[PDB]
Assembly symmetry: D3
Homo-oligomer: 117 residues x 6
């Protein structure tokens, strides 16, 4: 995932950051303090960006032509996953964080399927 390439990848990197995004959104509903809201927004932006980066890496580095041929919907899936993360950056609604997590889980399943083969 370092582009050497090292041969080591794991969608869990994207998932953990996406989990933080959702967890922060959940916390934003229980504390309306201004400074907490500011910090929560700032940090959510950072974690969502990292999640997007991790997905971009799977798409650009790990997945190869044979994979896109076997999974014709993969390009759209990853593109929708990163767009969902952008939507989560602009929202305090945990549902947006959840949507990103759901797409990531779909990508994770495909990832491990290509690893077994």
């Amino acid at each position: 995932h370092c582009d050497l390439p090292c041969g080591v990848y794991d969608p869990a990197q994207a998932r953990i950051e996406a989990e933080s995004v959702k967890a922060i959104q959940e916390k934003m509903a229980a504390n309306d303090d201004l400074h907490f809201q500011i910090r929560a927004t700032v940090i959510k932006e950072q974690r969502a960006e990292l999640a997007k980066h991790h997905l971009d890496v799977l798409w650009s580095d790990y997945f190869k032509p044979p994979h896109f041929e076997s999974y014709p919907e993969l390009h759209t899936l990853v593109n929708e996953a990163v767009k969902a993360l952008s939507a989560a950056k602009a929202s305090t609604d945990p549902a947006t964080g959840q949507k990103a997590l759901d797409y990531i889980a779909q990508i994770d399943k495909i990832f491990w399927e290509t690893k077994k083969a």
Copy 2:
């Protein structure tokens, strides 16, 4: 390109970094000094990574579903472009840097076409 969204995008960001990548490869071919080779490798790696990031941003943030519908080859094209940059990272052959630039030029053409419609 900052995901606000700010509405400001330009494939030029990717092109300039890719131009540096090819320029560095040309210099590496002419100077075999060990330390220069090390520094050139380090810097080329960094600029190619930035170029990949800029392309990933166009793909994830700027291009929308209607665009991928109008240009069914777009997903593949951007994926080829970033893979070409990965190839350039692992090469001192200016031809690899040029291949990345060729794809970026095709992406740039499509980008501006979407600005006309």
Copy 3:
């Protein structure tokens, strides 16, 4: 611009980021939502910092000693430009973003003049 040196520079890098700064300030006037204001401030800060970095690179790496002699106002011009960007960070007024862009335009003019020389 990578300090190898690679021989590749373009004020366009600083300009695109400064354009995002102004675009963000304009958007901040059309949406008083708290979270949008927070995100816009966060992102504007990041893009302005990148713009300053790009100008710093032109100043320290591209422009050579003779250039500052041929253009006696150059040091002051770049310094005023980065300070204008610092001012844009602390303001939601698009006029501050524009002021930075005006200075960048003057730097861009000198840049190309030295390129053709």
Copy 4:
């Protein structure tokens, strides 16, 4: 792990990066090409640094005073783990990468115990 706090942590972040470190070392032992050795060293340095950062975060943010009281050797364990990663940066021997992974596994076990407490 973002210091909000978000309540989301997983030693898996450190483990995956350490796995890349060892994987890179295995590749370095087989391919003596100068340019590959350069890139491998550059990238191994980066991934090892990320692994150290992830461990530092668990130590500074996740683990609380009661945890260090319950597991008196935890400070030493994490310190040994990060030092093992520094050693891996300076080595091409996969054994050094494995040593870091062994320490991380010890930390992972204590981590999950505190989670269940």
Copy 5:
């Protein structure tokens, strides 16, 4: 402090960033303007993170086993310092920035004593 190792370390790096954190909190006490509070929070978060990083480096790289033996409270002291910085990120009260600086001063004293032996 770069992990080469270079042999150059100074707690001053951590101290200067922590001084910025407290200085920012002091400025936040004087102005309730929304955008200033947002910018101050964003920047304070960044400087506190750098301060934690510098301390983590002293802990992981500079201090060796003999040092932890000679100063049994060192592990706890550094951990308290970084935790104090996390607390400063979440506060506008200069007292939190001061608490972090006090711990850093204690670490600084031990650091220079170890440079004596």
Copy 6:
């Protein structure tokens, strides 16, 4: 130095990084091992870049118009200092690192004079 502004500046930040640059150059002069040379080069590049950044910040943020008028040679001094750091990146000769340090000492002197004024 964070552009808030926070009012906290110290040339020590630039100096400590420049000291690492020279220290690394001296260590390179004593160990011709390939991998050590690679790591030393990679790390020297990073610390020199940080040193340049710190000087750029003093020039763009701390120093104001009155300072440049009182010290007509200040612009050129900082510019030559950063250029000296670029030269240090491209060299293994400790003399280049020392040249950078001598310029920083001159900037440090001026800095503190303006602080007492």
